[PDB]
Design a protein around this ligand. Structure first.
Ligand code: VGW
Ligand code: VGW
Lengths: 131, 131
């Protein structure tokens, strides 16, 4: 069964939000309706502004700004590690966070900059377990 | 706990896809970055093309078409019931389907037109239980 009786009146579909997110990632893979390029040092990442805003306090601030909402190109701080950004962008579109000993510091610093609080909190807990 | 060890290597966040979908619905409520208006008889519905394509075989066909991907206005068949469309648009953004005796036929006919197969299948099962 794909549905249940929600707490409210409605029929609710268990996997709907993840099925939507999978299609948004498929659109991203195929570069369909992507409307922004995020530049991180020498690297470029195409994405959908709505997904970025939905996942980050920094992108939410940028794309709700009357002047910046219309930008096609966004340059991040040149100190941002592109691999850390790539891991977080994949997480936004998949719910899967590829945290490893060799990338955890860059992922945490990037999530702090992008304002993804629960990812920062998660990185902190994994770091504390090895200390 | 908000995360777990997925079947693959990654840490996976349980509520991430639904937290993304909630923010996409908040953006829609506030008319932020909406890029299309769907016209259903005398009624207009503002939405995000990526969400519509992610949820419907008809919108996926339209917005991947080289000519139609750029349209700001999409007119649906004038025989489509606006309430049925509204219930399905809310479902796309919430995972919640407000199926009632008084709207089930219009919801089913609209889901057939929009190519939302599992919603059609769900309507059919609820209809069959009252027959
Ligand atoms: C700071 N922060 C985060 O740590 C995480 C954000 N998003 C994700 C999806 C990663 C998220 N949200 C909630 C939760 C916890 C379980 C409840 C976890 N993960 C987030 C999203 C917006 N974005 C918006 C905020 C409010 N209203 C709107 Cl319309 C938007 C948008 N778009 C802002 C700031 C944000
Ligand atoms: C016909 N049909 C549907 O019944 C339902 C669609 N989407 C939702 C989210 C409502 C959905 N998907 C899967 C499932 C079942 C559990 C597995 C349930 N509900 C759907 C989405 C696309 N959209 C795409 C299809 C393929 N690849 C891409 Cl990139 C897109 C997009 N965008 C097409 C046709 C579709």
């Amino acid at each position: 069964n794909l549905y249940f009786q929600g707490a409210d009146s409605c029929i609710q579909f268990t996997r709907h939000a993840s099925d939507v997110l999978l299609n948004l990632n498929r659109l991203r893979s195929r570069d369909i309706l992507t409307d922004v390029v995020i530049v991180v040092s020498r690297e470029q990442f195409r994405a959908h502004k709505t997904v970025l805003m939905a996942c980050s306090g920094l992108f939410y601030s940028i794309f709700t700004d009357q002047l910046k909402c219309n930008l096609s190109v966004i340059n991040l701080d040149p100190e941002i590690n592109p691999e850390g950004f790539c891991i977080l962008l994949d997480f936004m579109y998949t719910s899967r966070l590829n945290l490893r000993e060799g990338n955890i510091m860059a992922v945490m610093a990037t999530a702090m900059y992008l304002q993804m609080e629960h990812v920062v909190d998660t990185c902190r807990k994994f770091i504390k377990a090895s200390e």
